[PDB]
Amino acid sequence: GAGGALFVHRDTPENNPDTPFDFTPENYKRIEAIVKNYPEGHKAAAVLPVLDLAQRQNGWLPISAMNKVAEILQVPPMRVYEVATFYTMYNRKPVGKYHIQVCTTTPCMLRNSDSILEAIQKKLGIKVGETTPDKLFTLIEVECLGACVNAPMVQINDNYYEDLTPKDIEEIIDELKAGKIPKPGPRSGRFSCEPAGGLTSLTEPPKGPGFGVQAGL
Amino acid sequence: WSSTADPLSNLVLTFSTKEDAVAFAEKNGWSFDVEERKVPKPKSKSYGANFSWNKRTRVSTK
Amino acid sequence: APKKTSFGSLKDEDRIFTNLYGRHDWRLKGAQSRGDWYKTKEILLKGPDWILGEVKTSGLRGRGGAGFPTGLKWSFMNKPSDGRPKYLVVNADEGEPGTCKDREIIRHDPHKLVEGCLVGGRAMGARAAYIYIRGEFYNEASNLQVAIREAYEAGLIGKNACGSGYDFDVFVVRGAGAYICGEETALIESIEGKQGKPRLKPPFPADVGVFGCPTTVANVETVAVSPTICRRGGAWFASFGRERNSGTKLFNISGHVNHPCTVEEEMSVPLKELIEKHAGGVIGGWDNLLAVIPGGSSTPLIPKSVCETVLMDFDALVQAQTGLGTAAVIVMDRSTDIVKAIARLIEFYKHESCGQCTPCREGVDWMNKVMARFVKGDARPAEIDSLWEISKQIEGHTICALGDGAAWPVQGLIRHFRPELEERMQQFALQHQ
Numbered sequence: 284g285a286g287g288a289l290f291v292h293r294d295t296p297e298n299n300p301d302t303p304f305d306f307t308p309e310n311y312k313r314i315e316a317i318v319k320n321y322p323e324g325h326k327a328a329a330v331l332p333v334l335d336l337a338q339r340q341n342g343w344l345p346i347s348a349m350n351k352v353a354e355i356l357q358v359p360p361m362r363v364y365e366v367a368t369f370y371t372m373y374n375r376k377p378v379g380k381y382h383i384q385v386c387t388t389t390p391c392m393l394r395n396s397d398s399i400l401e402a403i404q405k406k407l408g409i410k411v412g413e414t415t416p417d418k419l420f421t422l423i424e425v426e427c428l429g430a431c432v433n434a435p436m437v438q439i440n441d442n443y444y445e446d447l448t449p450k451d452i453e454e455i456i457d458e459l460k461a462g463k464i465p466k467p468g469p470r471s472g473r474f475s476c477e478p479a480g481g482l483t484s485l486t487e488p489p490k491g492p493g494f495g496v497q498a499g500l
Numbered sequence: 501w502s503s504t505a506d507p508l509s510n511l512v513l514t515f516s517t518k519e520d521a522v523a524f525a526e527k528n529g530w531s532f533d534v535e536e537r538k539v540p541k542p543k544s545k546s547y548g549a550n551f552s553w554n555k556r557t558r559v560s561t562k
Numbered sequence: 563a564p565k566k567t568s569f570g571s572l573k574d575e576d577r578i579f580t581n582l583y584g585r586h587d588w589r590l591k592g593a594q595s596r597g598d599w600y601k602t603k604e605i606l607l608k609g610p611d612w613i614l615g616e617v618k619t620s621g622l623r624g625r626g627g628a629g630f631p632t633g634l635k636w637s638f639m640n641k642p643s644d645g646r647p648k649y650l651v652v653n654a655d656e657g658e659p660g661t662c663k664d665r666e667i668i669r670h671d672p673h674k675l676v677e678g679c680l681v682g683g684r685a686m687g688a689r690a691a692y693i694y695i696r697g698e699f700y701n702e703a704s705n706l707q708v709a710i711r712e713a714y715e716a717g718l719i720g721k722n723a724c725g726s727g728y729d730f731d732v733f734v735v736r737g738a739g740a741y742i743c744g745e746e747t748a749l750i751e752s753i754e755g756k757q758g759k760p761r762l763k764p765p766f767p768a769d770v771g772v773f774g775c776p777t778t779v780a781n782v783e784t785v786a787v788s789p790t791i792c793r794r795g796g797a798w799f800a801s802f803g804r805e806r807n808s809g810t811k812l813f814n815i816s817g818h819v820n821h822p823c824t825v826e827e828e829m830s831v832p833l834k835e836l837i838e839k840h841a842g843g844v845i846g847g848w849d850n851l852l853a854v855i856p857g858g859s860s861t862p863l864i865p866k867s868v869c870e871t872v873l874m875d876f877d878a879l880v881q882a883q884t885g886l887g888t889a890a891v892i893v894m895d896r897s898t899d900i901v902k903a904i905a906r907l908i909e910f911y912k913h914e915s916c917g918q919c920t921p922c923r924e925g926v927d928w929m930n931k932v933m934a935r936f937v938k939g940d941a942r943p944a945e946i947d948s949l950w951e952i953s954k955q956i957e958g959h960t961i962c963a964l965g966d967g968a969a970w971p972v973q974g975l976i977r978h979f980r981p982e983l984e985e986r987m988q989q990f991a992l993q994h995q
């Protein structure tokens with residue numbers, strides 16, 4: 284439906300050009316490595332990875348971070364604003380310690396993803412746009428995560444938790460807020476995109492290097 | 501309101517060519533000034549120039 | 563008995579992605595155990611023309627979803643150099659709902675993709691390869707980087723790749739959550755630090771591409787099969803499938819099936835056989851089948867009456883008015899609100915439009931509103947024909963093919979389930995006076 288996030292920036296005491304932001308020296312070395320991956324006349328190509336690195340170091344992207352990236356890469360700030368607003372993995376607002384994203388697309392939706400959404404909502408007490416008052420959990424709806432075979436699937440802090448049932452996501456939230464790291468992947472004894480039972484293919488051992496190499500080679 | 505005293509303040513004529521207008525003005529006894537027609541010169545447009553490898557024509561945004 | 567007429571059962575020895583389920587080490591050692599990176603030097607020293615000829619005679623068609631003949635496309639970039647460098651861009655965005663094949667290829671045997679990048683670059687005379695992986699695939703991209711590091715240390719790529727005397731680099735670039743960035747020109751724009759907005763053609767990427775240099779955008783599945791095709795030859799690959807539908811394919815079966823999975827099968831396998839063999843059959847029996855989307859959200863849905871004999875290739879599915887696309891099967895049983903699923907797909911396309919061109923930017927949102935009203939039933943039956951005309955206007959008038967992928971699902975829904983929409987509007991009218 285509606286987006287809910289505005290694409291106009293208004294200065295705030297918590298988000299203004301004079302908000303403190305700066306890369307760490309290690310991040311500066313990483314930026315150098317990122318920039319050295321492109322032809323010498325095209326350094327604007329590094330806008331996306333450097334912006335992502337700024338987000339990874341800071342957690343989100345204040346306007347000061349965008350201005351810093353624009354200054355580092357000698358790119359006009361409007362281009363960095365364009366990139367930051369176009370791509371949905373960029374957080375122009377603070378988020379929780381764990382960003383819970385649940386796919387609501389048709390393949391995921393067919394296999395009861397509403398159960399996962401309601402389980403998360405009931406366990407955390409927040410809706411699909413809000414944040415936990417502890418400021419450690421955030422819940423949103425995403426499109427398709429490319430893991431349709433395992434459904435419903437939830438991605439948290441760049442990790443995939445698949446083959447979910449309400450109990451599975453509930454215990455995932457419990458052990459995440461308990462300071463533990465839940466095992467990413469499915470939770471049905473499947474651990475891949477294989478059939479749930481039988482292994483209907485690739486049962487014979489794979490063969491060696493020169494199995495069917497043609498002649499004259 | 502806006503008042504006028506000259507009767508020709510609204511008169512505008514239309515002609516196919518400059519020569520016809522000149523002939524009309526001359527036969528009616530009016531002195532005239534002629535301005536030669538201005539045409540936009542043809543331009544060389546290239547959509548691929550937007551993404552040039554070494555030129556300054558490359559565009560930062562679309 | 564030449565010219566096979568019944569396909570759909572190939573055994574493990576004829577499969578390319580032998581580590582599809584990640585049961586063997588993906589570290590270089592497993593790839594070498596499985597025959598990966600074998601005799602790559604001899605293939606590289608055969609020249610680009612030989613590789614292009616093998617790819618042409620193999621009849622391989624683009625696995626991205628368009629089915630463009632790969633040999634001609636890769637030979638488009640076979641011109642003498644004019645000073646600008648040449649690049650190969652491997653597409654790994656994988657934004658189509660229902661598709662998971664590229665994820666498994668990248669995570670479970672990335673050395674196949676690396677060697678495909680090498681052989682494709684040699685064939686296309688490309689200086690380096692850029693792999694644009696989906697930003698959400700962080701672990702997959704990290705595994706790809708580990709494989710790339712192993713290849714660099716082993717001398718398989720970089721300066722003097724193998725012993726061919728050929729210099730080639732591979733770079734991995736991550737996106738940030740944009741489905742439109744899977745389109746080749748939008749992907750190129752995203753690599754160059756701009757918004758993921760497609761550019762018009764002509765020019766084609768073979769003439770003015772990434773950084774304004776000649777480049778070719780190819781799906782990761784298309785790239786990852788070229789080394790084995792070179793090793794086993796064009797003919798071995800061209801034997802499978804029908805004529806002009808050669809080779810094998812990865813299939814994703816999701817939705818209302820007992821055991822959703824991803825398998826490798828010969829191309830022209832019938833849909834029913836694939837569903838009841840690899841996916842364990844439709845949930846509740848084959849008689850509980852309502853509709854199947856054969857190739858992802860952009861392909862029109864077909865009713866159960868067509869899934870009894872239809873084959874899984876480009877030509878047969880085109881004759882069925884539904885297309886093959888990415889071979890992502892979404893199964894919907896008789897308990898499925900068929901209007902709700904199509905409305906959700908249209909909402910996805912409304913959230914994924916880049917906004918550049920008028921028909922997509924406005925008409926996809928218009929269709930989304932109309933379909934949201936259709937789900938409840940507020941509309942009148944004339945609005946069905948109105949929606950058909952709106953989809954017709956959008957299709958073929960947009961910069962890229964996302965307008966097509968938005969218009970086609972509603973066209974299929976109106977084609978095959980018009981009585982459902984009509985009766986839903988009737989029920990709403992009789993309920994709300």
Ligand SMILES: NC(=O)C1=CN([C@@H]2O[C@H](COP(=O)(O)OP(=O)(O)OC[C@H]3O[C@@H](n4cnc5c(N)ncnc54)[C@H](O)[C@@H]3O)[C@@H](O)[C@H]2O)C=CC1
Nearest residue numbers: 626627628630638656657658661744746766860887888963
């Ligand atoms: N893999 C995935 O997850 C997704 C796949 N798709 C599929 O993408 C399909 C449409 O893709 P398009 O690229 O827009 O179709 P297209 O036919 O315009 O292009 C297909 C390939 O053929 C090349 N090509 C076509 N005509 C050419 C020419 N005259 N000269 C040189 N090269 C030429 C193009 O450069 C391109 O690489 C859709 O049918 C969809 O199924 C869509 C979304 C996601």
Ligand SMILES: Cc1cc2nc3c(=O)[nH]c(=O)nc-3n(C[C@H](O)[C@H](O)[C@H](O)COP(=O)(O)O)c2cc1C
Nearest residue numbers: 624625626653655656657744745779780781784963
């Ligand atoms: C909106 C849109 C999204 C696309 N997303 C992808 C994608 O994620 N992965 C992919 O391989 N192709 C995608 N494509 C199709 C690309 O054009 C395709 O990758 C490219 O033509 C490569 O050609 P090939 O199929 O011969 O490899 C997309 C096309 C469109 C219109």
Ligand code: SF4
Nearest residue numbers: 916918919922960962
């Ligand atoms: S069709 Fe949609 S996604 Fe494609 S260029 Fe036009 S507005 Fe952008």
Ligand code: FES
Nearest residue numbers: 391427428430431
């Ligand atoms: S529909 Fe959920 S990952 Fe694609």
